[model samples]
Target: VKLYGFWPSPFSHRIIWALKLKGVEYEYIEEDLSNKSESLLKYNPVYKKIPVLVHGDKPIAESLVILEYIEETWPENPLLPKDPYERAMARFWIQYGVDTVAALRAFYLGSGEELEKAAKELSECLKILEEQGLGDKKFFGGESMNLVDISYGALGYWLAAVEEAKGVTVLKPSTLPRLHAWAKNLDELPVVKENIPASDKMLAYVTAAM
Candidate 1:
């Protein structure tokens, strides 16, 4: 197996963590996202995005899809639940994270009313995830890390960079205690800790965006 990813992308890092958690050995090729690697383009012709996974010369695009593929193929760590309804809900929450991507990007880029609106939208979505979806659980999958936990892993780590670079504190301990805790919990995991980009490296990128 070979995975193509970009250094600073949460999508890329999610796959990295997933592969690590499953104990799947593979070659990781970092992509030059600015220029767009030819292999990445070929592997993900439609989205042309990072986090593309290739196995036996067959490519899998989309991090969510790739994650599912990894889970099914490996069948060791078991990212999703065994029960059908639980599995469905896991997928549902994964989609919830995906739905927030636009608002997250908007929040990162915009200022003035637009920024306020984006922050409001993102906060609301995260609140729903924290209150309704997560409740008071140690992790989204209860005791262990699952696809749902991995799916939202970026929220715990990357958003901090955004808050620092943009000088905006949306996910705070006051308003988002659960989320703040969840982020720390996710970061503490060895697989997640190892795969995440260096803070100094990411700060440069987010500040450059700002």
Candidate 2:
């Protein structure tokens, strides 16, 4: 197995986290966005994006798709629940987290009314996850990390990096205590922390770009 990805991309990090958690051995190939590698284009012809997972002769595109494939292909360390209903719930939260990508972009890139609206939406979205999705569980799936953890962990890391770069707080303790605690716990996870990029480097990159 081989993975094609960029270091700074959250999408790429998602795959890295899943692989590391499952203890999968695979070669890593870093892609330059400005000059897309021939293999990357060939592997992901439709999207031509990073984080393409190649297993043997088959190529899997899209981060979420690759995530499911990895879990299904390697059943040793299960990421999803065994029960069908529980798995569905996990899928629901994962989709919800993915849908919050727009609010994240708006918060990171917008200003004034746009930023306010995005921030409000982000806060509300997180509130739902805190009260409803996560509730009182140590993790989204309880006791251990699951696919939902891998999915939202990327967002949490990115949001924290943005907060540092812009000097604005989104995941505040006063507003979302459970979610804030969850973020801190996720950061401390060995699989998550090791796979994520350095904060100082991410802050420098985000500050210049935003």
Candidate 3:
């Protein structure tokens, strides 16, 4: 298997973390955004984005789609539950996270009232995730990390970088206690912690984006 992605991209990092957690061996190809490779273009012609996973010469585009493929391909370290309803619920939260993920980018991409509004929406989304999706569970998969966790792990670092570089707190314990704790717990895992990009590097990227 060969994974093509860019280092600074959270979408790409999620794939890296998933592969590491599953103990799957694959070659990592860091794509240059400015000069996209011919292979990347051929594999993902529609979006032509990074984090394209190629297994057995079959290329999979989009982070979430690639995640499902990874989970299905390597069922040993299962990322989704076996129960039909449980699997449905996991997919629901994963889709929820993906749908609202743009809210996290508001801190780095918006300003003034725009930033405030985005923050409010993001806070609301996190609250829903905690109360409705998580509901006091150690993880979205109860005691173990799953697709939902992987789907949102990027926010853990992205929001932390936002707080570090911009001095803004969106995932604070005061407002998002459960989600805040979930972020810390996810970061503590070896697969997540080790695979995450360096804080300094992410801060620099956030600063530039802002």
RMSD of each: 1.2, 1.1, 1.1
* Top of the candidates by lDDT: 2
- Candidate achieving higher lDDT, 1 or 2: 2
Per-model C-alpha lDDT, please?
Answer: 0.87, 0.87, 0.87
TM-score of 1: 0.96
Q: 1-210, model 3: which lDDT tens digit per residue? A: 999999888899899988998999999999999899999999999999988999987999999999999999999889999899999999889878755776776656767888778778888888898899988999998999998899888768767888777666788889888889998999889888888789999889888877
Per-candidate clashes come to: 0, 0, 0
Tell me the TM-score of each prediction against the true structure. Answer: 0.96, 0.97, 0.96
- What is candidate 2's TM-score against the reference? 0.97
- Cα displacement (angstroms), candidate 2, residue 77, comes to 1.4
lDDT of 1 by residue, 60-103 (tens): 99999999999999999788999999999898888888767877
TM-score of 3: 0.96
